[PDB]
Structure 1
Amino acid sequence: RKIPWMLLSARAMVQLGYGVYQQRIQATLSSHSGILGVELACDKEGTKTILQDAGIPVPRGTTIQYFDDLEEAINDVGGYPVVIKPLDGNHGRGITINVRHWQEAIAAYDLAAEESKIIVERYYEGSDHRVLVVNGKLVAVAERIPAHVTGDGSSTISELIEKTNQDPNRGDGHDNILTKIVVNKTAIDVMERQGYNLDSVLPKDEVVYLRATANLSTGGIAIDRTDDIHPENIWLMERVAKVIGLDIAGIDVVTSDISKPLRETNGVIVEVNAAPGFRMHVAPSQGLPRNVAAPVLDMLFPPGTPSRIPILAVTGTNGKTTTTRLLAHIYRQTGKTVGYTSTDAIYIN
């Protein structure tokens, strides 16, 4: 688009444009992103409170400061199918997604207890969808699926991993679309809960997950679903971004069918993320890539506006300084701010 750019001397910032038309960015944050919005988005309790007060569907749940009250909390939440998270935010660890029994709730309790004193949420069924909204307007939707292998014949999991991890579209770190499947004690813990281990043979078409959550960097996939989203769901997503005051936002939605209204499929909004990444939308594993940047530059530099200021460059062997002072003096009679440089000094008005 012919917009000039520069790196700045502090905090990894980049400048776009010249003089009075300049803008700054830093990764996915910009000069248009407000602080009140970004801080609210980082407060899970605060975000939930604000959205449910606006009539927006969110998960049902409570606060237990590691007291053995889980057996009663389920009466307010909706029975045992619950989600237990560590109360604080310290990576995706110590989380049980689908608790079905009393003793499971306790095992989750004991792990949750590791973090400072989001517990017993009702468990909702569906897929994990990421919705990208840029200027109060929807840009892209992607479905996220965790690393897995399937019953592709009567082979074991270690055999299936070696078979599918040879796929040519799987390359190291941010190098190829997909990445490699790696098994560790945490993959084993996930497989054991499904009734399988590395030497187990899967039944035809059985699906076994090697991770509890979806992430492309851990070997999962991302499917573009941008054109399959229902008009009412589009309206709701845009309203959420406006309520929480963020320009560029990622919204995490759990639903079985993005093509039906969330009220009919019993879906919920789980999280609002300020300054989301773009890999899943510009390099999806299925579907067509989207030009995510174009909507960002359009809000920073709206159609019809300049990104540059006039530049008058004077050279030659003799007379440059005199010519420069006179030309700056003439422009100044129009009432504008004129900056100039010469061999004597740098001036502004």
Structure 2
Amino acid sequence: EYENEQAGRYAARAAVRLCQSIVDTGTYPATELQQDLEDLKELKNQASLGPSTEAIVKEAEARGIPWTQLGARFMIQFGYGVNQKKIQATLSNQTGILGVELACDKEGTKRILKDAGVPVPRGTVARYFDELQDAIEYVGGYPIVIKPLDGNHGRGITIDVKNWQEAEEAYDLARKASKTKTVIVERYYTGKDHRVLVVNGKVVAVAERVPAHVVGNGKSTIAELIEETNRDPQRGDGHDNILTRITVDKSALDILGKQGYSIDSIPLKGKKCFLRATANLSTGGIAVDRTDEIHPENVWLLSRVAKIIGLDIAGIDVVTEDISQPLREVEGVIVEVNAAPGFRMHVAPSRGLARNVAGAVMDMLFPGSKNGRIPILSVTGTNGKTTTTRLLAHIIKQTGKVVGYTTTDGTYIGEYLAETGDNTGPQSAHLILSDPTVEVAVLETARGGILRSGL
């Protein structure tokens, strides 16, 4: 038995070599064993699905929906024939190109949302220094935020500036970091960053990102807690776990320098003291579930935003003081929309109830109590397989249905020959079950096909 094909074949090849070595010399070198185990681990990690698509596949298996792996771009196909759907990671085959392209454009998304009456931060664009001061009275004063037009991983973006010189230096940094020399300036909004997941126009999960911090309730300072948190089993690196290890970086050191305290400074009364202010899970922050505390009007507004942009699965960033009140009384704003979000933080909140995002994705792809199955008729025997297959196909064709059938002569889809050759093995059955026009499948299952690769 194997779990990975290449790993299983490698282990089968290595077992006989190990046995030959141990019967020839009486023992096997430990270095060769370590080499074999590390090679097996490498093969296991090589053919592995992402943390999101595997979670979706687990729900698909539980609901009894067949799934195959296409060879193009790590795409997965659920169902058979005319009832099939495709997903890559979180993008489905019904996600529009226009919606994704609009979401990737920050400035166009902001204009579209503003035209629809959605509360968005008030900002301005500037390309010369003389304009900067002007924008300052347009946004309404201080504090302000300086960001580039185009950037990745937050290059050249400040968070909170309250005077002239810091604004000027941040503008210079952004201008030299931006690819187009131009810089946007927004009003700064105070609040807690929230991540809302919208599936099929319905809010599924809401999480609040609390920035990486430590609390001295145990009469202990930062110097011990930084490594005490890092020793918790929940923490991990990679793209699978929400909680990353607290990276004490030079930038992080400077940020905690701006905190006003020291490494050994004990927190007073046992109060939270932060290490960064970006409120991101990569830094080492945490997530708090708030799905039950959201106001119905906010749910309606976010559902409307997801449809205005035109995304079936969307991740919206909100900045508000309290999600339990409408976004009008509190100066709440919509910051950005992401087209292919990762629901990895909503299934392991670590401070609340986990939500079944994969269940919602499957409920969107296959609405009712239905799977992606089509009638399959498998003919086997010794003598009359081909004639029976052709007669079955001809009888079914009288009903207005497209029939795909495979015999020894070839593989047919309706009235036109689709493939030539023998085509009675499992490798020719995938062509029939993957065609987006086949409604009924008729398969001649030969003995050699079962012996060679199974059904």
Structure 1, residues 261-296: CA drift from partner, whole Å, max 9, x if none? 110111111111111111111111110111111121
Q: Aligned equivalents of 2:174 and 2:126: distance in 1?
A: 11
Runs of 5+ in structure 2 lacking a partner?
1-62, 415-455
Q: 2:133: which partner in 1? A: 71
Q: 2:195: which partner in 1? A: 130
Tell me, yes or no, if the aligned pair for 2:198 and 2:204 is still in contact at 8 Å: yes
Which deviates more, 243-252 or 294-303? 294-303
Structure 1, residues 112-170: CA drift from partner, whole Å, max 9, x if none? 12212262211111100011111111111111112122344664433331233333432
Tell me, yes or no, if the aligned pair for 2:68 and 2:78 is still in contact at 8 Å: yes
Tell me, yes or no, if the aligned pair for 1:188 and 1:197 is still in contact at 8 Å: no
Tell me, yes or no, if the aligned pair for 1:156 and 1:200 is still in contact at 8 Å: yes
Q: Aligned equivalents of 1:79 and 1:153: distance in 2?
A: 42
Distance change in 2, residues 1:24/1:119 (3 Å)? same
Superposed counterparts of 1:287-306, under 5 Å: 287-306=352-371
Counterpart of 2:409 in 1: which secondary structure? Answer: coil
Cα shift at 1:72:
2.5
1:97 counterpart = 2:162? no
Superposed counterparts of 1:49-60, under 5 Å: 49-60=111-122
Cα shift at 1:192:
1.9
* Match for residue 172 of structure 2 among 100, 110, 114: 110
Counterpart of 1:282 in 2: which secondary structure? Answer: coil
Superposed counterparts of 1:188-203, under 5 Å: 188-203=253-268
1:331 counterpart = 2:396? yes
Q: Aligned equivalents of 1:194 and 1:245: distance in 2?
A: 41
Tell me, yes or no, if the aligned pair for 2:200 and 2:313 is still in contact at 8 Å: yes
Q: 1:61: which partner in 2? A: 123
Q: Aligned equivalents of 2:302 and 2:146: distance in 1?
A: 26
Counterpart of 2:125 in 1: which secondary structure? Answer: coil
Superposed counterparts of 1:189-338, under 5 Å: 189-338=254-403
Q: Aligned equivalents of 2:317 and 2:88: distance in 1?
A: 23
* Match for residue 18 of structure 1 among 73, 80, 83: 80
Cα shift at 1:214:
2.3
Distance change in 2, residues 1:337/1:36 (3 Å)? same
1:163 counterpart = 2:207? no
Tell me, yes or no, if the aligned pair for 1:173 and 1:217 is still in contact at 8 Å: no
Q: Aligned equivalents of 1:171 and 1:11: distance in 2?
A: 28
Distance change in 2, residues 1:209/1:118 (3 Å)? farther
Tell me, yes or no, if the aligned pair for 2:193 and 2:320 is still in contact at 8 Å: yes
Give the number of the structure whose alpha-carbon radius of gyration is greater: 2
* Match for residue 145 of structure 1 among 210, 215, 234: 210
Q: 1:29: which partner in 2? A: 91
Q: TM-score, normalised by structure 2?
A: 0.73
Q: 1:3: which partner in 2? A: 65
Tell me, yes or no, if the aligned pair for 1:145 and 1:221 is still in contact at 8 Å: yes
Pairwise CA RMSD of aligned residues?
A: 1.8
Tell me, yes or no, if the aligned pair for 2:64 and 2:371 is still in contact at 8 Å: no
Tell me, yes or no, if the aligned pair for 1:156 and 1:198 is still in contact at 8 Å: yes
Q: Aligned equivalents of 2:271 and 2:143: distance in 1?
A: 23
Cα shift at 1:175:
5.8
Runs of 5+ in structure 1 lacking a partner?
none
Q: TM-score, normalised by structure 1?
A: 0.95
Counterpart of 1:63 in 2: which secondary structure? Answer: strand
Which deviates more, 292-301 or 269-278? 292-301
